[PDB]
Amino acid sequence: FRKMAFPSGKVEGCMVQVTCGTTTLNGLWLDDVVYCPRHVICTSEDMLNPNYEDLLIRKSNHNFLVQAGNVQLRVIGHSMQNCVLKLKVDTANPKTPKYKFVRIQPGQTFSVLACYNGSPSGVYQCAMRPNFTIKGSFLNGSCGSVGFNIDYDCVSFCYMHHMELPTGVHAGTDLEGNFYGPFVDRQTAQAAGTDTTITVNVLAWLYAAVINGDRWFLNRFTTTLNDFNLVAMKYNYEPLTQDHVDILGPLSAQTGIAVLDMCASLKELLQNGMNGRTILGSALLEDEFTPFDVVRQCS
Amino acid sequence: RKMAFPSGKVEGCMVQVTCGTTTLNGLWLDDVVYCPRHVICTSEDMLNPNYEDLLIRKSNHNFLVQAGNVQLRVIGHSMQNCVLKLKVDTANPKTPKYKFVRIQPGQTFSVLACYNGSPSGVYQCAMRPNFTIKGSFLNGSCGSVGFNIDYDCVSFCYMHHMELPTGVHAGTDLEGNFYGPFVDRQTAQAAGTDTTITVNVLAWLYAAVINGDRWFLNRFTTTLNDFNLVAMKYNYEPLTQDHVDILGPLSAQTGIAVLDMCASLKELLQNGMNGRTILGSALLEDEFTPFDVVRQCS
Ligand SMILES: *[C@@H](O)[C@H](C[C@@H]1CCNC1=O)NC(=O)[C@H](CC(C)C)NC(=O)OCC(C)(C)Sc1nc2ccccc2[nH]1
Numbered sequence: 001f002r003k004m005a006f007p008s009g010k011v012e013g014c015m016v017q018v019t020c021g022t023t024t025l026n027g028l029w030l031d032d033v034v035y036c037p038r039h040v041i042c043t044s045e046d047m048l049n050p051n052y053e054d055l056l057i058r059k060s061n062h063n064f065l066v067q068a069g070n071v072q073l074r075v076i077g078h079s080m081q082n083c084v085l086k087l088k089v090d091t092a093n094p095k096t097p098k099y100k101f102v103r104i105q106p107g108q109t110f111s112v113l114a115c116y117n118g119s120p121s122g123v124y125q126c127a128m129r130p131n132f133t134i135k136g137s138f139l140n141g142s143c144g145s146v147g148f149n150i151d152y153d154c155v156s157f158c159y160m161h162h163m164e165l166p167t168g169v170h171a172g173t174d175l176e177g178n179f180y181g182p183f184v185d186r187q188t189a190q191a192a193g194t195d196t197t198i199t200v201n202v203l204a205w206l207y208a209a210v211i212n213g214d215r216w217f218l219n220r221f222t223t224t225l226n227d228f229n230l231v232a233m234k235y236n237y238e239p240l241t242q243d244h245v246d247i248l249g250p251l252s253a254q255t256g257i258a259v260l261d262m263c264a265s266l267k268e269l270l271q272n273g274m275n276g277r278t279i280l281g282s283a284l285l286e287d288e289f290t291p292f293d294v295v296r297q298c299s
Numbered sequence: 300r301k302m303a304f305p306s307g308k309v310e311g312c313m314v315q316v317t318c319g320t321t322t323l324n325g326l327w328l329d330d331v332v333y334c335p336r337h338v339i340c341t342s343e344d345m346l347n348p349n350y351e352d353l354l355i356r357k358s359n360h361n362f363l364v365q366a367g368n369v370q371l372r373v374i375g376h377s378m379q380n381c382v383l384k385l386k387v388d389t390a391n392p393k394t395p396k397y398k399f400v401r402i403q404p405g406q407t408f409s410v411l412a413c414y415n416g417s418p419s420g421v422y423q424c425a426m427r428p429n430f431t432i433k434g435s436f437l438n439g440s441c442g443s444v445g446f447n448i449d450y451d452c453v454s455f456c457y458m459h460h461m462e463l464p465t466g467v468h469a470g471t472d473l474e475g476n477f478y479g480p481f482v483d484r485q486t487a488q489a490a491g492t493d494t495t496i497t498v499n500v501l502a503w504l505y506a507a508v509i510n511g512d513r514w515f516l517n518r519f520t521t522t523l524n525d526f527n528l529v530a531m532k533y534n535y536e537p538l539t540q541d542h543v544d545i546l547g548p549l550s551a552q553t554g555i556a557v558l559d560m561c562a563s564l565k566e567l568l569q570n571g572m573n574g575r576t577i578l579g580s581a582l583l584e585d586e587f588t589p590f591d592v593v594r595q596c597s
Binding site for chain 2: 001013113114122126136283297
């Protein structure tokens with residue numbers, strides 16, 4: 001199993017750069033609007049303690065340089081929505097894909113198109129951790145890079161990059177400018193909480209192992225969701241939601257193994273360990289492949 | 300993070316190629332579509348195909364090429380080793396600047412996995428020392444390509460043809476020559492014994508340090524030859540002086556001489572990881588080159 005990203009071309013066609021003064025970051029150009037992190041309106045010194053409403057009221061359309069490559073896009077309107085700036089421009093992006101804005105849950109994976117000065121550099125797959133960070137790969141100038149899924153021809157944008165934390169993980173917002181997790185777009189000390197294991201993805205991984213003929217760990221028992229959740233938390237595993245049970249449905253049907261039976265097999269792995277064995281070649285349980293990732297790759 | 304090149308320039312070149320009941324992908328550059336020649340085989344032909352004999356019996360109209368909703372008219376065809384070349388009556392306006400390159404084992408490249416001419420995923424792979432690649436390919440993925448991007452230029456280095464019994468993959472360069480001792484015939488084929496790409500493991504250890512993890516370092520050094528004696532014992536590739544030189548920038552950045560890092564890797568090989576992990580991995584990772592690490596860590 002590879003970390004496998006979505007093809008990035010539909011998103012590459014939407015990347016621009018946005019500059020205010022000497023502060024340059026990336027923006028997303030969809031129809032006649034450009035979306036970008038609002039901290040572009042900050043001097044580096046403003047970032048220590050910004051008042052965004054006051055900083056913005058002093059700005060006009062003509063203070064915003066938006067460029068697709070070297071080509072200027074004239075800004076004709078601006079507004080702030082939570083931590084994102086929306087810049088209306090006088091040109092509709094001819095490469096706009098079918099798209100939507102979605103807010104994802106922890107455990108969901110998405111592709112990130114890392115960009116610098118509006119120019120794509122790389123694409124990779126990330127999982128939103130339960131502590132609402134991602135283990136990204138971002139350097140200076142990467143803010144406004146976006147994360148996305150593609151379902152058919154529709155691009156679902158779920159992430160816009162804002163921050164690198166002390167442990168080296170990353171934080172950002174949805175495309176409505178609402179941060180994932182407790183973070184704020186201020187240059188003040190912040191830290192990720194203690195992370196936990198994404199149970200629904202581990203279960204997806206066990207289903208993947210069964211699909212591939214690796215099933216020593218299937219035990220004879222079952223459990224209730226509540227009992228499993230109370231046990232899992234003792235191992236620093238996330239509790240399951242009803243939505244988690246539901247998105248495991250197709251893998252449960254494919255294998256004939258009820259979700260709660262798989263939960264009992266995982267409970268025994270937690271309480272007794274691997275005892276020297278492996279699953280899909282690994283003594284470690286993988287938690288960054290969703291049920292959909294498992295189907296995408298076994299498909 | 301294992302990082303692939305943005306795939307858009309390549310997505311604009313993928314098409315679907317059908318011959319008979321066989322469908323796979325092609326690469327449409329200027330007025331030529333490149334795809335695996337085994338598209339021309341039946342089930343019975345694949346057992347032992349005399350490709351020159353099978354191809355001469357085909358006409359342009361036996362090839363259905365579809366770019367999205369448009370059929371491209373094939374107006375000629377030739378064969379170059381294991382790749383079929385279909386000339387079409389239309390230039391692909393999305394053709395990027397490009398070159399065809401043959402890569403060396405240990406080098407990395409991005410794969411755009413495609414089915415029925417449609418892109419499905421993008422990931423990073425390395426050419427293994429035994430000339431396989433550990434990809435993720437299913438039925439219908441043949442003709443998917445591997446590439447690198449420098450400036451605006453796409454360097455194509457791989458076209459996908461087959462999966463081996465062990466689950467690894469084999470294919471050709473864009474001149475149709477296989478990597479490795481494989482043949483585009485429907486027979487079980489084993490690869491040679493694989494080895495671990497040592498210069499890449501060392502690049503990855505430097506990456507682990509750059510990101511603050513140094514539990515595996517030690518106070519010792521080693522000579523190049525004594526390291527290579529141990530490496531070969533553990534089925535690691537030998538490290539060459541050019542490898543040492545390529546690791547220069549990472550050595551400078553961390554203040555850790557290459558032969559010092561070799562001494563740390565020697566200890567890991569002889570002692571294992573003792574339950575610990577490096578950059579989240581329980582195994583030593585060998586599919587990042589020095590260049591890959593440098594680009595992403597600077
Ligand atoms: C994009 O503008 C940029 C992307 C960063 C740059 C390096 N890698 C990235 O992902 N973001 C910022 O510079 C961002 C801007 C603020 C207005 C949100 N600042 C940021 O990430 O600051 C980090 C904090 C100060 C919020 S917390 C922190 N991070 C570290 C890292 C190392 C030591 C200590 C530390 N404390």
